[PDB]
Ligand binder design. Sequence first.
Ligand SMILES: CC(C)(COP(=O)(O)OP(=O)(O)OC[C@H]1O[C@@H](n2cnc3c(N)ncnc32)[C@H](O)[C@@H]1OP(=O)(O)O)[C@@H](O)C(=O)NCCC(=O)NCCS
Ligand SMILES: CC(C)(COP(=O)(O)OP(=O)(O)OC[C@H]1O[C@@H](n2cnc3c(N)ncnc32)[C@H](O)[C@@H]1OP(=O)(O)O)[C@@H](O)C(=O)NCCC(=O)NCCS
Ligand SMILES: [Cl-]
Ligand SMILES: [Cl-]
Ligand SMILES: [Cl-]
Ligand SMILES: [Cl-]
Lengths: 504, 504
Amino acid sequence: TERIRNVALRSKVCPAETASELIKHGDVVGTSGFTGAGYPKEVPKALAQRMEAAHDRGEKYQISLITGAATGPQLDGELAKANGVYFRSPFNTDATMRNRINAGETEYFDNHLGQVAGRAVQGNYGKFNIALVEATAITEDGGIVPTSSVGNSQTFLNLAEKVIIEVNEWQNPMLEGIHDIWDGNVSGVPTRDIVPIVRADQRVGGPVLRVNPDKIAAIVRTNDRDRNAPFAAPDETAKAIAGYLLDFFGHEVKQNRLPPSLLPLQSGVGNVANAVLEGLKEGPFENLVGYSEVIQDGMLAMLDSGRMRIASASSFSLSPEAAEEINNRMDFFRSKIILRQQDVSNSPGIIRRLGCIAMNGMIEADIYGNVNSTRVMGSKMMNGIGGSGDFARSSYLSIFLSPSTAKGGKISAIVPMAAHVDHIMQDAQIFVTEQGLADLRGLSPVQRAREIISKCAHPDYRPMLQDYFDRALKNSFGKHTPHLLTEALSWHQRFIDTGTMLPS
Amino acid sequence: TERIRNVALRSKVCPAETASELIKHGDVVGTSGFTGAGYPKEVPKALAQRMEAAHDRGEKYQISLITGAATGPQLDGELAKANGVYFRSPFNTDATMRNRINAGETEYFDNHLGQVAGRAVQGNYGKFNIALVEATAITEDGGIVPTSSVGNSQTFLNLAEKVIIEVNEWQNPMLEGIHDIWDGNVSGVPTRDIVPIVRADQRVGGPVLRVNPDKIAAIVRTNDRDRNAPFAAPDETAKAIAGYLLDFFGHEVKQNRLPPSLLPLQSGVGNVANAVLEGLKEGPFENLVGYSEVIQDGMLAMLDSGRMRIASASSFSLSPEAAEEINNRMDFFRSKIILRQQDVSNSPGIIRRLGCIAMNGMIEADIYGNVNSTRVMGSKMMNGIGGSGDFARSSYLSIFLSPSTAKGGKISAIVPMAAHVDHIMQDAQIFVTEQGLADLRGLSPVQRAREIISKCAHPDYRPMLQDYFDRALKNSFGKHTPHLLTEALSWHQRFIDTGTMLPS
Ligand SMILES: CC(C)(COP(=O)(O)OP(=O)(O)OC[C@H]1O[C@@H](n2cnc3c(N)ncnc32)[C@H](O)[C@@H]1OP(=O)(O)O)[C@@H](O)C(=O)NCCC(=O)NCCS
Ligand SMILES: CC(C)(COP(=O)(O)OP(=O)(O)OC[C@H]1O[C@@H](n2cnc3c(N)ncnc32)[C@H](O)[C@@H]1OP(=O)(O)O)[C@@H](O)C(=O)NCCC(=O)NCCS
Ligand SMILES: [Cl-]
Ligand SMILES: [Cl-]
Ligand SMILES: [Cl-]
Ligand SMILES: [Cl-]
């Protein structure tokens, strides 16, 4: 039917290809989109084609692309294939864009997701020329109904000179009412407002994004799917990880250090975090509440089993098949989900107030429990820090989860020294691998090392880590956090040189 | 005049030595005291004597010492001399204690200062046996008036099984009224209360610490001074740094990115700090506001002149001459100063809301602008992370300031890779050295490196840094954050082996 319920605005409809012409070379473009959900699809595809042609003619044509978080093939993919992004922030999962970044062809900075709005308002990315936002519908009074995500859309709408809306009939109209958009000052000029959230299920705003209709330069009708990668069905490794964490949660409850309903849960992006939620869907903890950035398949499964009552997040980040399931049952899930601005879902003040439990994956940790979430070998970007820092530092408990090895055992996820740090020791209390769980609360670095090495390291690597740690204890410059700088990054170099961290 | 205005509690007065007998081997002891101010004095000295005597006779006697932040010679100094501390948290500046930590004789973990109360309440440090708190006075209704700091005192009083109070007649009676102690839930069991501070000058609580008088096991009448590291007059390096920073502030104001009154300021303590505060006093600004951890000489000067209108902090950090000045004029200054619990002064929710400008020192930064504030060569502790993370991550602007070299030029403060990371790139926007100022806002890591190397690095190390960077750009595993892992920590190893980072 007609998703644009506002009669007057219907006069601004033009084809995706034409709307794309509003976007000029050098422009700073703010888009909707929060990891496989709610990003604009058709105007980028059309812009990507117009860029390729322009380059071939010798015309410069690149934008700065600021988003909520990751997008999808239609946006990051198309624009990277076309070589059309000179600067990208804050988060990406597209293979082609990742290649541009790691080749030095697209400049990239992975800001903390909860801070992006505030930094944009400050002017850190420059002046916003375009806001490109996907919508479920436009209301009679001109409200823009968001889709599978909120992200930074409200901020970009405020900041941008010109606005382009994509109304996507693929998105289930029962999405209207799911979002909560606050009109208060979260990320504007100080002093900011108090955000009155005191419970994860509390709504404090309205269902629509607000914009001056005068700034709307184009409206695009679309019917295209959010495209995310499916999740790995939990294997023996992921199930073991989930088993250790559930045991830990149970022990906390028995010792009265957690409620039996736990505390508001944040679950990070990726396969491992997701696998933990599949364990929780049939766990002994009832009346659970999510206060997360994303609701992945596993979180939807907790709402389905009823083990979780409600989930706050900024987006759905579902597999192609999970996205079908929620669509066919939108009436059920609608009342169990609240989608918020990402500067609210990822507000450290709110996270700490609620006492969230943070669960995040990781590339690697060193023996002292510093965590790399991003840069393989210290230099090659994977996805980005995302909101792992927003949550790890603000949480009641910060938990990191990973297989103890990677690349079929050729890499140890527990190393003498992390090649890049995203999360300092202070920001990580609990580590879980398929080998076991390290509880680091109240421990000095040397004490942390004993736990991590003994509980979490793979048997193939444990003796090597013990060997490093023992010689560091004897020979390190200082003994507070013992290191041998000649060897600290040698396992990484050994991998680069030989394809494996195992010695010859 | 009598400092103990509650008659009932007067019966609990006893000698320091006798009071110290209440503290047993293995006890967890929480004390008042925030860097050089307001820590207990006489009971720790007596305890240290008895610990040494026990040790000399083959008997173990050690405690876990949890504080606000740093203490002074009477506490950290004496107990470290006696080898009386098995675990220490969260911050120390005593040289003897630093030696115990770096030799592995005292276990140490430097928690974020704003988080210590919460983690104590969570039980991370174990059960508190003793709270040892210095007081200015005890009021008619049994309220405890703290002294030159608040720190974690209220939390420790709540948790401890038994309480010892030191009533210190050296501390000015007019300190009564300067503190703001909240009974709200800042660091207790979730869900926490909204901390309703919307102005730096806002009081939310009352002037006294509260404790059940039945837990008070001993009261000690004392008369001993706070001891802090002496006043360091700004050298040419510090003045140059302050110069670049003030020019930057001046520029932001002229571009309308800051008000002429700037934003609430958090300043560290250091040679640079004093130069910055002096520049601020002379600069083209007005109506300044402090929302910091400490109040230093420079703030008092601006409060006196009217350049600063109010200063919020958890503690004083004054030279003996400034202490003299405030001791004689406590009536005037107490109207301009608010001393808060450190879980409030260092609350990320409040820091972000007020939009604080954070200015902190550092050991070193790598070329990508990751910051080490703590661990020389990655293994030798200096002081601790303190509140630098609380502020850096939560601030409107995060600035790090340092001489571009250390150890008389034999160490470069800009290195290929930091040997330990306290503040990731995402947490540092501005760097200032005596060489110049790097503004990193909106930049990718490679862009950050070009700015840091060109603006901040010492000319003597610049060719070496640029050489590393150029070769990494050519050879690094990925090009997003280019490194040569064979060389990354080689300058540190060169220092360890030869005493300088320079080759030939
Ligand atoms: C860290 C992160 C990449 C891991 O995701 P994950 O699904 O839990 O981890 P997986 O075990 O499934 O491995 C995923 C990929 O990372 C690679 N990887 C993981 N650890 C690695 C390591 N130590 N060395 C090299 N590669 C590694 C794996 O090889 C795998 O790639 P491949 O299948 O092509 O070989 C992911 O959590 C992430 O993107 N974190 C950054 C954003 C974030 O922190 N979000 C949390 C809050 S929303
Ligand atoms: C990092 C820190 C020690 C620097 O202090 P500073 O006064 O600004 O810096 P200085 O140039 O005066 O040097 C201080 C000490 O660190 C050493 N130092 C500084 N940089 C160094 C480096 N790159 N390599 C080796 N040593 C270094 C100096 O030698 C000196 O120690 P020394 O007496 O043994 O010689 C200090 O800022 C700190 O402790 N930060 C952590 C806590 C914090 O930031 N709290 C916030 C508010 S105070
Ligand atoms: Cl808030
Ligand atoms: Cl801890
Ligand atoms: Cl709050
Ligand atoms: Cl930025």
